[PDB]
Amino acid sequence: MKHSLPDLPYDYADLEPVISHEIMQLHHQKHHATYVNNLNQIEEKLHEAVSKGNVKEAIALQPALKFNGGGHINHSIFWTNLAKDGGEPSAELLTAIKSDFGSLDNLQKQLSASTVAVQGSGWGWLGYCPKGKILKVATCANQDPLEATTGLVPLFGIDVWEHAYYLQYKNVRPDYVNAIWKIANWKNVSERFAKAQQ
Amino acid sequence: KHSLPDLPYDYADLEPVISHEIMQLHHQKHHATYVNNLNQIEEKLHEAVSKGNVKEAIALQPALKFNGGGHINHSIFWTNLAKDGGEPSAELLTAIKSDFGSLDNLQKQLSASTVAVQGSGWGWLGYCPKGKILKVATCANQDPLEATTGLVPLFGIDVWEHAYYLQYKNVRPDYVNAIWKIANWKNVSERFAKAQQ
Amino acid sequence: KHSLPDLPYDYADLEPVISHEIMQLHHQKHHATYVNNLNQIEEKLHEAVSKGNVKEAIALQPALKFNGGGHINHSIFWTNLAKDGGEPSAELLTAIKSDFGSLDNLQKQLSASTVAVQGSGWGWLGYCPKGKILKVATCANQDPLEATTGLVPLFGIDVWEHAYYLQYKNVRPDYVNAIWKIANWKNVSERFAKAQQ
Amino acid sequence: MKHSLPDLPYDYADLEPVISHEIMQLHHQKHHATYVNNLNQIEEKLHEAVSKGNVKEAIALQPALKFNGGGHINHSIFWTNLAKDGGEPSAELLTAIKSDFGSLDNLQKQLSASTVAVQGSGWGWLGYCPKGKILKVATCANQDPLEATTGLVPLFGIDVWEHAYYLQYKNVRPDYVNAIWKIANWKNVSERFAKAQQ
Ligand SMILES: [Mn+2]
Ligand SMILES: [Mn+2]
Ligand SMILES: [Mn+2]
Ligand SMILES: [Mn+2]
Incomplete structure (x- = not known):
């Protein structure tokens, strides 16, 4: 096994x-x-x-x-x-999104802000707290993985290591973070949410 | 186990x-x-x-x-x-004098660094296999010296409050100063010899 | 000053x-x-x-x-x-039940998180002004809750060994359980009210 | 003042x-x-x-x-x-370099290795310990500055944030770290060493 x-x-x-x-x-x-x-x-x-x-x-x-x-x-x-063709959040997921963030727009705004604010290399995540039964925005330093280090089950992540956007966006990290929503695979995120509730 | x-x-x-x-x-x-x-x-x-x-x-x-x-x-x-820990070996004393000037200076430096630990931790006299010199280092919580720094531990001072509170209460510096009276130099010397192998 | x-x-x-x-x-x-x-x-x-x-x-x-x-x-x-800290206000109890199910559940969760602190630190019942909900959080050493997390502190449990060692020795869990007997709910309730302003 | x-x-x-x-x-x-x-x-x-x-x-x-x-x-x-025209280390500096590292080649090898090994964003530094009167290789995370955070006086630093080399070197950080020695301003490093001993 490897x-x-x-x-x-x-x-x-x-x-x-x-x-x-x-x-x-x-x-x-x-x-x-x-x-x-x-x-x-x-x-x-x-x-x-x-x-x-x-x-x-x-x-x-x-x-x-x-x-x-x-x-x-x-x-x-x-x-x-x-x-390229992400789709849209599942009915179950959106109910929770609205519950914990008020709206999808509020979620995207908050995840984007937290992700852009990462000092150095890191990741921004939309995560599910299994114990609290609540959706949370979190950031991780370097390659610290979400679940192992916080208990939060990862649903959607945004890599803000400079290698994830520099060749294209140069120093303009916020443009990358806002543009990544255009390619967010909501089908995958919804699937991860369903599993995280099991 | x-x-x-x-x-x-x-x-x-x-x-x-x-x-x-x-x-x-x-x-x-x-x-x-x-x-x-x-x-x-x-x-x-x-x-x-x-x-x-x-x-x-x-x-x-x-x-x-x-x-x-x-x-x-x-x-x-x-x-x-x-109880009776003797004195540093000839070899260890030579290294102490070389790296710290004197045993008194080493004691002073290690004591000061150890007292300055914020929260729980340890003070250590260690040997750097790369530089082939003695060094003072501190570790947070139970972070072990060698695994986390590469320095080989020779003499440690535990400053978790449980190491001294019942007796010394808040006065950590008095415990750190007093521990030198019971430093087992025979063991520190043995550890130094082994660290050089 | x-x-x-x-x-x-x-x-x-x-x-x-x-x-x-x-x-x-x-x-x-x-x-x-x-x-x-x-x-x-x-x-x-x-x-x-x-x-x-x-x-x-x-x-x-x-x-x-x-x-x-x-x-x-x-x-x-x-x-x-x-000595006699009363009971949570109506408002605070409503929030506790909403966020933790019951006061017993809150006590259990905060006690467990606080006991699990590695080394010196604090356990806190705090209010998140953004989520408008109560949360359990722990802080290392003397890291203060609000400055470092944004959570407004409502009730804290000091688990530095100096907070309990003379009496409880190594048995931190017994101190954490017993502190609920002297929790000043009047103050926690006042802090909750102020946190909502 | 600003x-x-x-x-x-x-x-x-x-x-x-x-x-x-x-x-x-x-x-x-x-x-x-x-x-x-x-x-x-x-x-x-x-x-x-x-x-x-x-x-x-x-x-x-x-x-x-x-x-x-x-x-x-x-x-x-x-x-x-x-x-572009760095020059060479001062007599005082080289004596210390030889004392603490054996040679300039050993110093460059060790600083290069430590710098390349930085996880995420950070810096590699050649520093002077004022108390120990010894030269040390150290690394710093993100923008943590050397002197303020360690007491070591910085003499020569290598920025390994991905923005410092990605457009040119892409993922090949070691090529950048080894090539930077070609442009090391030894005159400046020597000056910093002289001040650090004061
Ligand atoms: Mn990446
Ligand atoms: Mn101990
Ligand atoms: Mn305390
Ligand atoms: Mn830079």
Whole structure:
């Protein structure tokens, strides 16, 4: 068993004009592949340490597992979160969206603001709190994955690492964050919401 | 399986620097709890990693560092103390003088850094295998020195309030100063020798 | 200048939940130290910012958060406790039931989160002005709730070991459970009303 | 009194082929300018809070001051750290370099490795410990400035935020980190070392 780089649900140029094909190819083939490749090696070293009962070595490996494992989790979710033909939120999801945010417009505004405000590299997420049964906006630093680090089940994420938009948008992160809503795969988000309530 | 080590001395053997009650609680309750939790968390982590459950493996990280670190830190700490801990080896004293000027200077610097810890944590005299020099470092909570910094621990000062409160109350500096009276230089010297291998 | 507030009760008035000695040390030593240090650090920060010394201003940040936070947190904490603290207001109980199902559920959730704090910190019942709902949150060390999260503090549980060790020793959960007996619901209710303005 | 965007010691295309003119212009006119502009506003708000004795507000402003103030400190140092004609380390500096690293080659190797290993956005620095009287390699996250956060006096820094190299180097951060040594302003580093020993 090993982790593998998932195929994108679309071709590399399918998200143009919102995300360029060069960003998509680099992001997928170089950035995500690197996280996966490192993840496999780190997981092996971690299993080795844990099997030995070597607590020092297991702790030492934690930042690398979080970063690469998180990188893999986050990008895997991200690819599915996007579509040229996203559709619209499910009836169940919109009820909750209206309940916790008032409207879809309020949700998009709040997620966009929080995401743009990330200092350095990171992610913005729409998440579901299983315990509170409530929808939440959260941000994560670097590749810290949402669920593992907060308990929130990720529904929709926006990658704001500079590699996610710089070639196209340069320093103008807000233009990317607002434009990404045009390609939000609501069908996928709705599916994730349904699973998160199980 | 990880186990609570026996102390190298009786619980009252470090009085009047650290009381019987502190030693007993610190060993039988605090360290024991870290060990027990460590075993539980290590088992869960083994399962998660075995099955390639990266989410679960990441989720367990704070608990493993805290409890695993607690086990590492306290295991070292007990061996770092003694009723009569002697003096640094010739080799260690040479290194101390080289890196800190004098034993008094080392004590002063490590004590000051340790006292300055905000909240719970540890003060450490450590050896850097890369620079081949001694260094003062502090760690938050139960973050273990070597796993998190690469520095090999030689002498640690626990400044979690449970390490001194029953006796010293708020006066952490007095505990940090007094612990030098029971520093087990035989052990610190042995750790220094091993760190150089 | 920042000053140590007088307690709303005598030092032994919270017995047998929190001892006279704990209250006296916690107030006269721990809180007093945060206040004294806060005044020193605020003065240095005023000077640094006045002169546009960004380096110095940044360097003072851990000390200001720790000591300023200590002052904020303990100031609230004293008012959150009482010998006879009554019951939540009608309004607060409605909000508690809405957000947590029951007062018992709130107590359980906040107690569990607070007990789970690794190292030194605080447990808080807070009000989110954005969501207009009650929330359980924890803070590390002296990180103050509102400045760091935006949540308005309503009821806090200090789990720094100095808050309970002399009496409860390692058994933090018993202290966290017992503190509900002296929760000053009059004050929590007043804070809730003010948070809604 | 206010903070201002310093002029670069050279023209925008002067660091080509090692750093492109588009990177330099964006980095200076957009990224650094943003930090300065925000810094001025945040410092005013902080002075207001501190003058009032409003501890909550002063604490609340800390991340924004660290980030923007740090951004300003770091980039200000960075521009001076580079040159088409850097020269060579001073006699005093090289003695210390040899003492703490064995050689210049060992220093460059170690700083390069640490810098490349930064997870997310950050900086790699050659720093001077005033207390230990020793040279150290350190890294900083996001815009955390070296001296304020560690006590180490910065001598030479390498910006590894993706905006510092992506347009040119794409994902290949190591090529940028190794190539930046070609433009290291040793005269400036030597000057900083001399001041740090005072
Ligand atoms: Mn990415
Ligand atoms: Mn301890
Ligand atoms: Mn306290
Ligand atoms: Mn930069």
